[PDB]
CSV table of C-alpha atoms in Angstrom, one decimal:
chain,number,residue,atom,x,y,z
Z,1,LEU,CA,0.0,0.0,0.0
Z,2,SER,CA,1.7,3.3,-1.2
Z,3,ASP,CA,1.6,6.5,0.8
Z,4,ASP,CA,-0.7,8.0,-1.9
Z,5,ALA,CA,-3.0,4.9,-1.6
Z,6,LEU,CA,-3.0,5.2,2.3
Z,7,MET,CA,-3.7,9.0,2.2
Z,8,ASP,CA,-6.6,8.4,-0.4
Z,9,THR,CA,-8.3,5.8,2.0
Z,10,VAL,CA,-7.8,8.1,5.2
Z,11,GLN,CA,-9.2,11.1,3.2
Z,12,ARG,CA,-12.2,9.2,1.7
Z,13,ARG,CA,-13.3,7.9,5.1
Z,14,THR,CA,-12.7,11.1,7.1
Z,15,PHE,CA,-14.8,12.9,4.4
Z,16,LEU,CA,-17.6,10.5,5.2
Z,17,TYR,CA,-17.8,12.0,8.9
Z,18,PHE,CA,-18.9,15.2,7.3
Z,19,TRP,CA,-20.8,13.8,4.3
Z,20,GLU,CA,-22.7,10.8,5.9
Z,21,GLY,CA,-22.3,11.8,9.6
Z,22,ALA,CA,-23.8,15.3,9.2
Z,23,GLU,CA,-26.9,16.4,11.1
Z,24,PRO,CA,-29.7,16.0,8.3
Z,25,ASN,CA,-31.6,19.4,8.6
Z,26,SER,CA,-28.4,21.6,8.7
Z,27,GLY,CA,-26.0,19.4,6.6
Z,28,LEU,CA,-23.5,20.5,9.3
Z,29,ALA,CA,-21.1,18.7,11.5
Z,30,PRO,CA,-22.3,17.4,14.9
Z,31,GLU,CA,-20.0,18.1,17.8
Z,32,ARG,CA,-19.5,14.2,18.2
Z,33,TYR,CA,-20.4,10.9,16.5
Z,34,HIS,CA,-20.6,7.7,18.6
Z,35,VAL,CA,-20.6,4.4,16.7
Z,36,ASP,CA,-22.1,2.8,19.9
Z,37,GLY,CA,-25.1,5.1,19.7
Z,38,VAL,CA,-24.7,6.2,23.4
Z,39,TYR,CA,-24.6,9.9,24.0
Z,40,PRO,CA,-24.1,10.9,27.7
Z,41,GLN,CA,-25.3,14.5,26.9
Z,42,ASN,CA,-28.0,13.2,24.5
Z,43,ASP,CA,-26.7,15.6,21.9
Z,44,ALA,CA,-26.4,13.6,18.6
Z,45,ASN,CA,-28.2,16.6,16.8
Z,46,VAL,CA,-26.0,19.3,18.4
Z,47,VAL,CA,-23.9,21.0,15.6
Z,48,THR,CA,-20.6,22.8,16.3
Z,49,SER,CA,-19.8,26.1,14.4
Z,50,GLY,CA,-16.0,25.7,14.4
Z,51,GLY,CA,-16.0,22.0,13.5
Z,52,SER,CA,-18.4,22.8,10.7
Z,53,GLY,CA,-15.9,25.3,9.2
Z,54,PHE,CA,-13.4,22.4,9.1
Z,55,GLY,CA,-16.1,20.1,7.8
Z,56,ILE,CA,-17.2,22.5,5.0
Z,57,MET,CA,-13.4,22.5,3.9
Z,58,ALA,CA,-13.4,18.7,4.1
Z,59,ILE,CA,-16.6,18.6,1.9
Z,60,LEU,CA,-14.9,21.1,-0.6
Z,61,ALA,CA,-11.8,18.8,-0.9
Z,62,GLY,CA,-14.3,15.8,-1.5
Z,63,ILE,CA,-16.1,17.7,-4.3
Z,64,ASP,CA,-12.8,18.6,-5.9
Z,65,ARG,CA,-11.6,15.0,-5.9
Z,66,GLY,CA,-15.0,13.7,-7.1
Z,67,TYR,CA,-16.1,11.8,-4.0
Z,68,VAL,CA,-19.5,13.4,-4.7
Z,69,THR,CA,-20.8,15.0,-7.9
Z,70,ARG,CA,-20.7,18.8,-8.6
Z,71,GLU,CA,-24.6,18.8,-8.2
Z,72,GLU,CA,-24.5,16.9,-4.9
Z,73,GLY,CA,-21.8,19.1,-3.4
Z,74,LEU,CA,-23.8,22.3,-4.4
Z,75,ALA,CA,-27.0,20.8,-2.9
Z,76,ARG,CA,-25.0,20.3,0.5
Z,77,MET,CA,-23.5,23.9,0.4
Z,78,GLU,CA,-27.0,25.4,-0.3
Z,79,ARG,CA,-28.4,23.4,2.7
Z,80,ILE,CA,-25.5,24.6,5.0
Z,81,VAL,CA,-25.9,28.3,3.8
Z,82,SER,CA,-29.7,28.1,4.3
Z,83,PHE,CA,-29.2,26.9,7.9
Z,84,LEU,CA,-26.5,29.6,8.7
Z,85,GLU,CA,-28.9,32.3,7.3
Z,86,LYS,CA,-31.6,31.2,9.8
Z,87,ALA,CA,-29.6,30.0,12.9
Z,88,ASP,CA,-29.0,32.2,16.0
Z,89,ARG,CA,-26.4,34.9,15.7
Z,90,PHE,CA,-25.1,37.5,18.3
Z,91,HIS,CA,-23.9,40.7,16.6
Z,92,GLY,CA,-23.3,38.6,13.5
Z,93,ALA,CA,-21.1,36.1,15.4
Z,94,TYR,CA,-22.2,32.4,15.7
Z,95,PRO,CA,-22.4,30.5,19.0
Z,96,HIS,CA,-20.3,27.4,19.8
Z,97,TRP,CA,-23.3,25.1,19.4
Z,98,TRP,CA,-26.8,25.0,17.9
Z,99,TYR,CA,-29.5,22.3,17.8
Z,100,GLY,CA,-29.2,21.3,14.2
Z,101,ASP,CA,-32.9,20.8,13.7
Z,102,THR,CA,-34.0,24.3,15.0
Z,103,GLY,CA,-30.9,26.5,14.7
Z,104,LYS,CA,-31.4,27.6,18.3
Z,105,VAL,CA,-28.2,28.2,20.4
Z,106,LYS,CA,-27.2,25.5,22.9
Z,107,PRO,CA,-25.2,27.1,25.8
Z,108,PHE,CA,-21.7,25.7,25.9
Z,109,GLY,CA,-21.7,26.6,29.6
Z,110,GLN,CA,-24.3,28.7,31.7
Z,111,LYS,CA,-23.0,32.1,30.8
Z,112,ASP,CA,-21.7,30.9,27.3
Z,113,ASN,CA,-25.1,31.3,25.7
Z,114,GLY,CA,-24.3,33.8,23.0
Z,115,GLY,CA,-21.5,34.5,20.5
Z,116,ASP,CA,-18.2,32.7,20.4
Z,117,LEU,CA,-15.8,34.7,18.2
Z,118,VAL,CA,-13.1,32.0,18.0
Z,119,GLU,CA,-15.6,29.4,16.7
Z,120,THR,CA,-17.0,32.1,14.3
Z,121,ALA,CA,-13.5,32.6,12.9
Z,122,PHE,CA,-13.1,28.8,12.2
Z,123,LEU,CA,-16.4,28.7,10.5
Z,124,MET,CA,-15.6,31.9,8.4
Z,125,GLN,CA,-12.1,30.4,7.4
Z,126,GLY,CA,-14.1,27.5,5.8
Z,127,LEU,CA,-16.9,29.7,4.3
Z,128,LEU,CA,-14.3,32.1,2.6
Z,129,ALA,CA,-12.7,29.0,1.0
Z,130,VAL,CA,-16.1,27.8,-0.5
Z,131,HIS,CA,-16.7,31.4,-1.5
Z,132,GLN,CA,-13.5,31.4,-3.6
Z,133,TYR,CA,-14.2,27.9,-5.0
Z,134,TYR,CA,-17.7,29.0,-6.3
Z,135,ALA,CA,-17.0,32.8,-7.1
Z,136,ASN,CA,-16.2,32.0,-10.7
Z,137,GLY,CA,-18.4,28.9,-11.1
Z,138,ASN,CA,-21.8,28.7,-12.9
Z,139,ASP,CA,-24.7,31.1,-12.1
Z,140,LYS,CA,-26.1,28.8,-9.3
Z,141,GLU,CA,-22.6,28.5,-7.8
Z,142,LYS,CA,-22.0,32.3,-8.0
Z,143,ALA,CA,-25.5,32.9,-6.3
Z,144,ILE,CA,-24.3,30.5,-3.4
Z,145,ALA,CA,-21.0,32.6,-3.2
Z,146,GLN,CA,-23.0,35.9,-3.0
Z,147,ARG,CA,-25.1,34.4,0.0
Z,148,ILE,CA,-21.8,33.4,1.7
Z,149,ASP,CA,-20.3,37.0,1.2
Z,150,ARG,CA,-23.5,38.4,2.9
Z,151,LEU,CA,-22.9,36.1,6.0
Z,152,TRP,CA,-19.2,37.1,6.1
Z,153,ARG,CA,-20.1,40.9,5.8
Z,154,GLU,CA,-22.7,40.5,8.7
Z,155,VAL,CA,-20.0,39.3,11.3
Z,156,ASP,CA,-19.5,42.4,13.6
Z,157,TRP,CA,-15.9,41.6,14.7
Z,158,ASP,CA,-15.6,45.2,16.0
Z,159,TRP,CA,-18.4,44.7,18.5
Z,160,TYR,CA,-16.3,42.1,20.3
Z,161,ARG,CA,-13.7,44.8,21.2
Z,162,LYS,CA,-16.2,45.6,24.1
Z,163,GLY,CA,-16.6,49.4,23.4
Z,164,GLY,CA,-13.4,50.0,21.4
Z,165,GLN,CA,-10.6,48.3,23.4
Z,166,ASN,CA,-7.5,47.2,21.4
Z,167,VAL,CA,-8.2,43.4,21.9
Z,168,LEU,CA,-10.9,40.9,20.9
Z,169,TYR,CA,-13.1,39.2,23.6
Z,170,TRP,CA,-14.0,35.5,23.1
Z,171,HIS,CA,-17.7,35.8,24.1
Z,172,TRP,CA,-20.7,38.1,24.2
Z,173,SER,CA,-24.1,37.1,25.7
Z,174,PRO,CA,-27.4,38.9,25.3
Z,175,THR,CA,-28.2,38.0,29.0
Z,176,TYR,CA,-24.8,38.0,30.7
Z,177,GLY,CA,-23.1,40.6,28.5
Z,178,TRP,CA,-19.3,40.5,28.9
Z,179,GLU,CA,-19.3,38.3,32.1
Z,180,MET,CA,-17.2,35.5,30.5
Z,181,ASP,CA,-14.5,38.3,30.4
Z,182,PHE,CA,-11.9,36.5,28.2
Z,183,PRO,CA,-9.7,39.0,26.1
Z,184,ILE,CA,-7.6,36.8,23.7
Z,185,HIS,CA,-3.8,37.2,23.9
Z,186,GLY,CA,-1.4,35.1,21.9
Z,187,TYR,CA,0.0,32.6,21.3
Z,188,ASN,CA,-2.9,30.0,21.2
Z,189,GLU,CA,-5.1,28.4,18.5
Z,190,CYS,CA,-7.0,31.8,17.8
Z,191,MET,CA,-4.6,33.8,15.4
Z,192,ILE,CA,-7.0,33.5,12.3
Z,193,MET,CA,-9.7,35.2,14.4
Z,194,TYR,CA,-7.5,38.5,14.5
Z,195,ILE,CA,-6.6,38.1,10.8
Z,196,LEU,CA,-10.3,37.8,9.8
Z,197,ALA,CA,-11.2,40.6,12.2
Z,198,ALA,CA,-8.7,42.9,10.3
Z,199,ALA,CA,-9.9,41.5,6.9
Z,200,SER,CA,-13.7,42.3,7.4
Z,201,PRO,CA,-14.8,44.6,4.6
Z,202,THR,CA,-17.6,46.0,6.8
Z,203,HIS,CA,-16.8,45.7,10.6
Z,204,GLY,CA,-13.0,45.4,10.4
Z,205,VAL,CA,-10.9,46.2,13.4
Z,206,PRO,CA,-7.9,48.7,13.7
Z,207,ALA,CA,-4.3,47.1,13.4
Z,208,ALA,CA,-3.8,48.2,17.1
Z,209,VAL,CA,-6.3,45.4,18.1
Z,210,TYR,CA,-3.7,42.8,16.7
Z,211,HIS,CA,-0.5,44.6,18.0
Z,212,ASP,CA,-1.9,45.6,21.5
Z,213,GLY,CA,-4.3,42.7,22.1
Z,214,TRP,CA,-3.0,39.5,20.3
Z,215,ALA,CA,0.8,40.4,20.4
Z,216,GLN,CA,0.6,42.6,23.6
Z,217,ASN,CA,3.3,44.8,21.9
Z,218,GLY,CA,5.9,42.1,21.4
Z,219,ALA,CA,5.3,40.2,24.7
Z,220,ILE,CA,4.2,37.2,22.4
Z,221,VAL,CA,7.9,36.8,21.4
Z,222,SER,CA,9.6,34.7,24.1
Z,223,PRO,CA,12.3,32.3,22.7
Z,224,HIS,CA,12.7,29.2,24.9
Z,225,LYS,CA,13.7,25.5,24.5
Z,226,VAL,CA,11.4,22.5,25.0
Z,227,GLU,CA,12.7,18.9,24.5
Z,228,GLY,CA,16.0,20.5,23.2
Z,229,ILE,CA,14.0,22.3,20.4
Z,230,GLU,CA,13.8,26.1,20.0
Z,231,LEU,CA,10.3,27.8,20.2
Z,232,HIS,CA,10.1,31.5,19.3
Z,233,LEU,CA,6.7,32.4,20.8
Z,234,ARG,CA,5.1,32.8,24.2
Z,235,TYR,CA,2.5,30.0,24.5
Z,236,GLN,CA,-0.4,30.9,26.8
Z,237,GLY,CA,0.0,29.2,30.2
Z,238,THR,CA,2.4,26.5,28.9
Z,239,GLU,CA,6.0,26.0,27.5
Z,240,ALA,CA,4.4,24.1,24.4
Z,241,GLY,CA,0.7,23.8,23.7
Z,242,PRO,CA,-1.4,20.9,22.4
Z,243,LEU,CA,-0.6,20.2,18.8
Z,244,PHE,CA,-4.0,21.6,17.5
Z,245,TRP,CA,-2.6,25.1,18.2
Z,246,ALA,CA,-0.3,24.6,15.2
Z,247,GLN,CA,-3.2,23.5,12.9
Z,248,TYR,CA,-6.6,25.2,13.3
Z,249,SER,CA,-5.5,28.8,12.1
Z,250,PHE,CA,-3.4,27.2,9.3
Z,251,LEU,CA,-6.2,25.2,7.5
Z,252,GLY,CA,-6.8,28.1,5.1
Z,253,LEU,CA,-4.0,30.5,6.2
Z,254,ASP,CA,-1.0,29.1,4.3
Z,255,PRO,CA,2.0,28.9,6.8
Z,256,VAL,CA,4.6,28.3,4.0
Z,257,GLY,CA,6.7,31.5,3.8
Z,258,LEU,CA,4.4,33.3,6.2
Z,259,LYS,CA,6.1,35.9,8.4
Z,260,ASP,CA,5.3,39.1,10.4
Z,261,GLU,CA,6.9,41.4,13.0
Z,262,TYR,CA,6.5,38.6,15.7
Z,263,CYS,CA,7.7,35.5,13.8
Z,264,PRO,CA,10.3,35.2,11.0
Z,265,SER,CA,8.5,31.9,9.8
Z,266,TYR,CA,5.1,30.6,11.1
Z,267,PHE,CA,6.0,27.4,9.1
Z,268,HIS,CA,9.2,26.7,11.1
Z,269,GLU,CA,7.5,27.7,14.5
Z,270,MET,CA,4.7,25.2,13.9
Z,271,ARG,CA,7.1,22.5,12.6
Z,272,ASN,CA,9.1,22.9,15.8
Z,273,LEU,CA,6.0,22.7,17.9
Z,274,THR,CA,5.2,19.4,16.1
Z,275,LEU,CA,8.8,18.2,16.7
Z,276,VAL,CA,8.5,19.1,20.4
Z,277,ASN,CA,5.3,17.0,20.6
Z,278,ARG,CA,7.0,14.0,18.8
Z,279,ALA,CA,10.2,14.3,20.9
Z,280,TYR,CA,8.2,14.2,24.2
Z,281,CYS,CA,6.3,11.0,23.0
Z,282,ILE,CA,9.6,9.4,21.9
Z,283,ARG,CA,11.1,10.2,25.4
Z,284,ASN,CA,7.9,8.8,27.0
Z,285,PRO,CA,9.0,9.6,30.7
Z,286,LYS,CA,5.7,8.1,32.1
Z,287,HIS,CA,6.5,4.8,30.3
Z,288,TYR,CA,3.1,4.4,28.4
Z,289,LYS,CA,2.6,1.5,26.1
Z,290,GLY,CA,3.1,2.2,22.4
Z,291,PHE,CA,4.6,5.7,22.6
Z,292,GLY,CA,7.5,6.1,20.1
Z,293,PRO,CA,8.6,7.2,16.6
Z,294,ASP,CA,5.7,5.3,14.9
Z,295,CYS,CA,3.1,6.4,17.5
Z,296,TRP,CA,3.0,10.0,18.8
Z,297,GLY,CA,0.7,13.0,18.9
Z,298,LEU,CA,-0.7,14.8,22.0
Z,299,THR,CA,-3.6,17.2,21.7
Z,300,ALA,CA,-7.0,18.0,23.3
Z,301,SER,CA,-9.5,15.0,22.8
Z,302,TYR,CA,-11.5,12.4,24.6
Z,303,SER,CA,-9.5,10.9,27.4
Z,304,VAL,CA,-9.7,7.7,29.5
Z,305,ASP,CA,-11.5,9.6,32.3
Z,306,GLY,CA,-13.5,12.0,30.0
Z,307,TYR,CA,-12.0,14.8,27.9
Z,308,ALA,CA,-8.6,16.4,28.4
Z,309,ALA,CA,-6.2,19.0,26.9
Z,310,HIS,CA,-3.3,16.6,26.3
Z,311,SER,CA,0.0,18.3,25.6
Z,312,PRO,CA,3.7,17.3,25.6
Z,313,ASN,CA,4.4,17.5,29.4
Z,314,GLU,CA,4.1,15.0,32.3
Z,315,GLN,CA,1.1,16.9,33.9
Z,316,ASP,CA,-1.1,16.8,30.7
Z,317,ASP,CA,0.1,13.5,29.3
Z,318,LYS,CA,-2.4,10.7,30.2
Z,319,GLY,CA,-1.2,7.9,28.0
Z,320,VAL,CA,-3.6,8.9,25.2
Z,321,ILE,CA,-2.7,9.3,21.5
Z,322,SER,CA,-5.0,11.4,19.3
Z,323,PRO,CA,-4.5,10.6,15.6
Z,324,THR,CA,-5.5,14.2,14.6
Z,325,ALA,CA,-2.3,15.5,16.3
Z,326,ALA,CA,0.4,13.7,14.2
Z,327,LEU,CA,-1.8,13.4,11.1
Z,328,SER,CA,-2.9,17.1,10.9
Z,329,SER,CA,0.9,18.0,11.1
Z,330,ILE,CA,1.6,16.2,7.7
Z,331,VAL,CA,2.1,19.7,6.1
Z,332,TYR,CA,5.0,20.3,8.6
Z,333,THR,CA,6.5,16.8,9.2
Z,334,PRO,CA,5.5,14.7,6.1
Z,335,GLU,CA,7.6,11.6,6.8
Z,336,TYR,CA,7.0,11.5,10.6
Z,337,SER,CA,3.3,12.0,10.1
Z,338,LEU,CA,3.0,9.4,7.4
Z,339,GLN,CA,4.9,7.0,9.8
Z,340,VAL,CA,2.2,7.4,12.4
Z,341,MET,CA,-0.6,7.2,9.7
Z,342,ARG,CA,0.9,3.9,8.3
Z,343,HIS,CA,1.2,2.5,11.9
Z,344,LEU,CA,-2.3,3.6,13.1
Z,345,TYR,CA,-3.8,2.1,9.9
Z,346,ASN,CA,-2.0,-1.2,10.6
Z,347,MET,CA,-3.5,-1.4,14.1
Z,348,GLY,CA,-6.8,-2.3,12.3
Z,349,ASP,CA,-10.5,-1.7,13.0
Z,350,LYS,CA,-9.9,-0.9,16.7
Z,351,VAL,CA,-8.5,2.6,15.7
Z,352,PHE,CA,-9.5,3.0,12.0
Z,353,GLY,CA,-13.3,3.0,11.9
Z,354,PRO,CA,-16.0,3.8,9.3
Z,355,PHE,CA,-15.4,7.7,9.3
Z,356,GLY,CA,-11.6,7.4,9.6
Z,357,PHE,CA,-9.4,7.2,12.7
Z,358,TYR,CA,-11.2,7.3,16.0
Z,359,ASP,CA,-10.7,10.3,18.3
Z,360,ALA,CA,-8.2,9.0,20.9
Z,361,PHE,CA,-6.9,5.7,22.4
Z,362,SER,CA,-4.8,4.4,25.2
Z,363,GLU,CA,-2.7,1.2,24.5
Z,364,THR,CA,-1.8,1.2,28.3
Z,365,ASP,CA,-5.4,1.3,29.5
Z,366,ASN,CA,-6.7,-0.9,26.5
Z,367,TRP,CA,-9.2,2.0,25.8
Z,368,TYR,CA,-10.3,2.1,22.1
Z,369,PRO,CA,-13.5,4.3,21.9
Z,370,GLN,CA,-15.4,4.1,18.7
Z,371,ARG,CA,-16.0,7.8,18.8
Z,372,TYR,CA,-15.4,10.9,16.7
Z,373,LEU,CA,-15.3,14.7,17.2
Z,374,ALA,CA,-15.8,17.1,14.3
Z,375,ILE,CA,-12.8,19.3,15.5
Z,376,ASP,CA,-10.4,16.3,15.4
Z,377,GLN,CA,-11.7,14.8,12.0
Z,378,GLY,CA,-11.8,18.1,10.3
Z,379,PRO,CA,-8.1,19.0,10.4
Z,380,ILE,CA,-7.1,15.5,9.2
Z,381,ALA,CA,-9.1,15.8,5.9
Z,382,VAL,CA,-8.0,19.4,5.3
Z,383,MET,CA,-4.2,19.0,6.1
Z,384,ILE,CA,-3.9,15.8,3.9
Z,385,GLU,CA,-5.5,17.9,1.1
Z,386,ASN,CA,-3.2,20.9,1.7
Z,387,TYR,CA,-0.2,18.6,1.7
Z,388,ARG,CA,-1.2,16.8,-1.5
Z,389,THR,CA,-2.5,19.8,-3.6
Z,390,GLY,CA,-2.5,23.0,-1.4
Z,391,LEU,CA,-6.3,23.3,-2.3
Z,392,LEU,CA,-7.6,24.9,0.9
Z,393,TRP,CA,-4.6,27.3,1.2
Z,394,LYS,CA,-4.9,28.3,-2.5
Z,395,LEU,CA,-8.6,29.1,-2.2
Z,396,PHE,CA,-8.5,31.0,1.2
Z,397,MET,CA,-5.3,33.0,0.3
Z,398,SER,CA,-6.9,34.1,-3.0
Z,399,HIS,CA,-9.7,36.0,-1.1
Z,400,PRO,CA,-9.3,39.8,-1.6
Z,401,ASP,CA,-10.5,40.6,1.9
Z,402,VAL,CA,-8.1,38.1,3.5
Z,403,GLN,CA,-5.2,39.6,1.4
Z,404,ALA,CA,-6.0,43.1,2.6
Z,405,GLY,CA,-6.3,41.9,6.2
Z,406,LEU,CA,-2.8,40.2,6.0
Z,407,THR,CA,-1.3,43.4,4.5
Z,408,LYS,CA,-3.0,45.6,7.2
Z,409,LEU,CA,-1.5,43.5,10.1
Z,410,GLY,CA,2.0,43.4,8.6
Z,411,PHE,CA,2.0,39.8,7.3
Z,412,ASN,CA,4.1,38.7,4.3
Z,413,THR,CA,4.6,35.6,2.1
Z,414,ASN,CA,8.0,34.8,0.4
């Protein structure tokens, strides 16, 4: 089985999470999919906005490869856009969750019952990619693009500055206001939210919002070594974050040759964060079964005792490998990621299920859940596509508002 053949199989099955596993009314990605049919939160119909952005990009890659016909793919995009035009919005921003059948918000926590700007950014990164795919298509495709541009123009990023501060807040509630009180400072998984906030052709934010808020005037630059590997940035509350922090903002945003005032190369920073993750698993100081060069990758996912923000350190390491971590880093470490992909595939049905690799597993605890999460499946399909053809990067980087946003914030590609 060639690397191309293996990638084709992993891509086709991961695509089926979003094609066949979608909530029927919305056509969107449910937060989770349990092969066992047992849902502790009884939320099979609860759709995630962020994961749906990844899912929409996963469906786009499928259409381009011919997994579904041009007509079938357009019928799905139309269904998704119709749901988004109707579902609950908070100053144009989308909540973390909705009930897929009604489009009503599902609070992600008591006071988190409104807009979630980070999740809105992950959805918009996907929608701008579909916009660029259909912008020069037939008349029906161009009409779909026009509807997407209206949703994009309706997101009021500037509102989330909480009365003109030079920072973006994560949440806003119509009942609890600003009570979640989370201003977003880098570095974490949320960079694309500041790039899209600056890109908005209607409610765009000043550059000061990125320089004073995200970068905190250079405080985001903090060179340090982790596992003998040099990292350039300050990671929020950690020496090296979970591997998804190197992936979510780079599904559409092309890291190759990307640089700005705070990082001479986002590609090399994220490659090093991947290498730190792999180095920790190879070291395996907690002596977990299976951890090594063929099996590595620590990120946030289901865990033996529930859900956990796994990261490459002894406090967050629980003996749980999440296939999304190593596999969505294929664009940074092609050989090491294909090594884990080849090894995970050879473990059989216990980890490679109907909609691709299952969320997480522990060889030590003999814990092999037959469960998926949209946010872990999404990056696998998109990063394999970007590695193979650069499709999602080409589409997203071609958007004129995105290009103006990158220039505004001082980003460069060379």
